[model samples]
Target: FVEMVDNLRGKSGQGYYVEMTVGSPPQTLNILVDTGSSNFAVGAAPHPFLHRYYQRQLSSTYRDLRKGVYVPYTQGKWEGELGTDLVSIPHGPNVTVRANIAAITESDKFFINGSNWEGILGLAYAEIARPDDSLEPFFDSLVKQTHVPNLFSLQLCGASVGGSMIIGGIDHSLYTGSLWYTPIRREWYYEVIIVRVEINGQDLKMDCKEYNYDKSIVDSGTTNLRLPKKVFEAAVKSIKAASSTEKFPDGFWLGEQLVCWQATPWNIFPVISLYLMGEVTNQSFRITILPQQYLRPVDDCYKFAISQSSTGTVMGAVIMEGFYVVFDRARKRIGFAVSACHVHDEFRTAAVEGPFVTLDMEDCGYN
Candidate 1:
């Protein structure tokens, strides 16, 4: 079948954008894509050169529902009206989503601070429904009449070497080995039950009975792993206690990423493994965060894995960087495999990509 691949944007280059054709003659706007939240929204002009919102008055297919959409993010919240239009993603066609609704915000929270991208295309569950619920997610609408399947795949890179995504169908070439599939524990967040977590071959003692701590979401929207505050404290405490590294000054590591100032043997650091649920054929699908894959050099030295503090644990690109991840809604399961270009034991400290490329602060989870 036919699959479409949209180039991701930004300095770290993990962010994704899709072109939506709206307005009379049709205006192609780049909207940042997300799986953590729902609501296809656009941004207003603070950086007019970057990206902007859709003015309903300019579009022939636009229909303002006169309802308000309230969406909150880490940096800011989005508020706008409900509407419909003809939108097309790379893999999907330019089909009219009859009642397609969009949110247009004035701030830049949806685009991770300093990013040149605008708006947000949320792929979360048909949105948190309510009596006044306006519209379903764009993908849900596309599934009804489409060119893409009910699945998508992401190939995330750790080196700012860049990553790619597919709207529907799996790309066997992006990955090298067989996939490890796990059933989705929930529909809203592409979440799964993490049976256990092991570091450097030792299992971490976890107490999920108290707060249902076994659950974790696979969120590409986030750059780093944002673990629940309780779990994050324990993870950092344990890593430091187990690993052999010199003491560093305070204010070095970010709450969302595991970074360091200098170089250290990866083996001396912890090798994190997340064991997920599976069916009878294959149980406990393991996703490993190898030292070489997660320990990236930043600001002369380097940063180890990551550290995140949020309501729940999110296995973001920091860890998922090593794999070709697949999200399948048709069967309600998620899959992972070693990337075709990236293998655990084989990694170069640096790569030569034609022209010399520089690093970006956002790649280190800053701001």
Candidate 2:
């Protein structure tokens, strides 16, 4: 996956994107690597920033499905027509794959608020597909059609937008030791069981009534970890109760997900850990959120990483920054490995092409 990986960097560190060409003769454009949805669409909001649109006139391979489509997100939704065309992604430089249908938005609610990429290349399952439900994730389709493998991985560069979505490969050097694996709890999101959660080892009792104990999924698109209201409140109370001796400034965090006091070092806060079900019997792995992952440089200065449902708890870029993850649906399991990522270690391997992330399907990823 490393040598053959065709990845992209983010803009101002929002989300990662890739270079794509739609229609025939190909209109070059940039797109966000969205793993939450399963529909591929473009030209909905003002996309001049990426100069993208499926111009029926320019491409000879364009096909009009003559259907309206709508894809929604947490804060916004995309309204457009459903259509099909020849689209190209990172398998090979000239590799062209057929995207069944897309939601070509004529109107958007809040899609382009701060997004730099032109459109979303949904990495979710086909069940979540919109504008028509049969549409599968572009990556999955690549595997089903023999264009790639039944595997793909995301190397999300935490500090910047430079991340790689390795198709049909795996990178062992990016991570150390062994990989902890888990089967998919559901097919929708990369949903899985948390098994148990603790603050420095104190039980949160995450109350499995609502979600079957440890219910959640991965969202590389998100910037932080998200838990249910009750879960968040309970976790907050426990952390305060178990406040480590190595603490924050007297009046550092000013509530509402904000913090101040410029002189405080990010390493002072205690680490929060999540125990996820791993591969094998009674097996599990621990994902840690170091103090730095929680604190951010606010307008004044580092704030708490304070911040889902069917909507699973989002294990976003923050907690996941230090781990190498593989979402393997075909094997019905997901895998993770401890990464070398840290405060100063982000984006170094990805952008500089360091040692981790080793993969290649024969001649698929070469010069």
Candidate 3:
């Protein structure tokens, strides 16, 4: 059975309220949703990086427990007080989980750009909570500690502008279709895999090598389909060929000049498909072609800044705007489906939620 969950819930004083907490203190803070990453963190007054944007609400049960805690990121350094805090997410139950409340005393070291978040909750798989030394992933720790089950799933719906990540088990009522199964690669953190990718009905045989299995993580937090150099190049070539352009946007900035094109004009605009082993492709996964010159460099001479240590690209939330993806943790499988908006019928909806009636021994046939 399939069930759909609402995305929006209540309103706070000025806008909608999102719950958050510090450490495992069971306190809750109303923050916003960030579909970019999975590690749950909060913004505190006097952060090291952007102190001006940090909201200092000491009276909101905010605690400074940074005496013995440190967390790092790709671009910056951050350490905070760890505690279990409550977060009131719209359309979802109030959750109390372990998190780091940004430290006000050392605000100068951990500032971020474009301050729209009080803090951020990175939902992607990886050791976002501890970038140094420890490689333990946040969600995996939650599953291990919870002991309810080692597996968890997320069904995100709508634009990250206003969407939800249903944790724990799946809601059987949200899906009315059969579960399409795909075998996962053994080393993909949680045995996840992307068996194949197709463009305009043409197969693009790409190797699914584990660039950094230890650091690799599966996430429903992002929307755009991110890939490594080889994968991205091949896919981009096909996309450009379909659009008949030589340039496109470089990254998510939406204004970077990084474009390429194919030879034919008649094949303008093609559908890209991602196929998972054992899953049906009647409703193939796809993305639209962008104009060749969508992404350009600042000086117009360079294309993109290639990172030497970059493992792979992160599929951000932009690509997941209107489809449903399922993570079968128990069997180590993943599934995908197409969905339409129910409330806002005008827009396309991707009902990405699950943890359905625990698949028992009978459902283990795929193994």
> Could you say which candidate leads in TM-score?
2
What C-alpha lDDT do the candidate models reach, one value each?
0.61, 0.62, 0.40
Model 2, position 214, has a per-residue lDDT of: 36
TM-score of 2: 0.82
Regions of candidate 1 where Cα sits further than 4 Å from its true position: 1-3, 44-49, 91-99, 108-113, 127-134, 158-161, 208-214, 250-264, 296-305, 308-310, 343-367
- Error at 27, model 1, angstroms: 1.9
As for TM-score, the candidate ahead, 1 or 3, is 1
lDDT of 1 by residue, 1-367 (tens): 2344435544442455555555555666766667777677775434444545566667777767767667777656766666777776544443555535554644434445455555777776764532133467777877877755788777765433455667767878777757877777668777776655666657667653211253477876676766666666666677777764666444444534444444245555676776666643334556777666555555445554465554567777676777888888889998888776553554332111111122221121111
lDDT of 3 by residue, 328-347 (tens): 65666655544333122222
State model 1's lDDT.
Answer: 0.61
Residue range 236-335, candidate 2, lDDT tens digits:
6776666665455434433354455645643334567766665555545566666666655553565565552334467777766667778886787877
Flag regions of model 2 displaced more than 4 Å: 3-6, 44-51, 90-94, 101-103, 206-214, 243-257, 298-300, 308-310, 344-367
What TM-score would candidate 1 get against the native?
A: 0.81
Report the poorest 10 consecutive residues by lDDT, candidate 2. Answer: 358-367
Runs in model 3 deviating more than 4 A are 1-4, 7-18, 21-38, 46-77, 83-91, 94-115, 123-160, 172-176, 183-191, 206-217, 220-223, 245-255, 258-267, 278-309, 342-367
- The 10-residue segment of model 3 with minimum total lDDT is 8-17
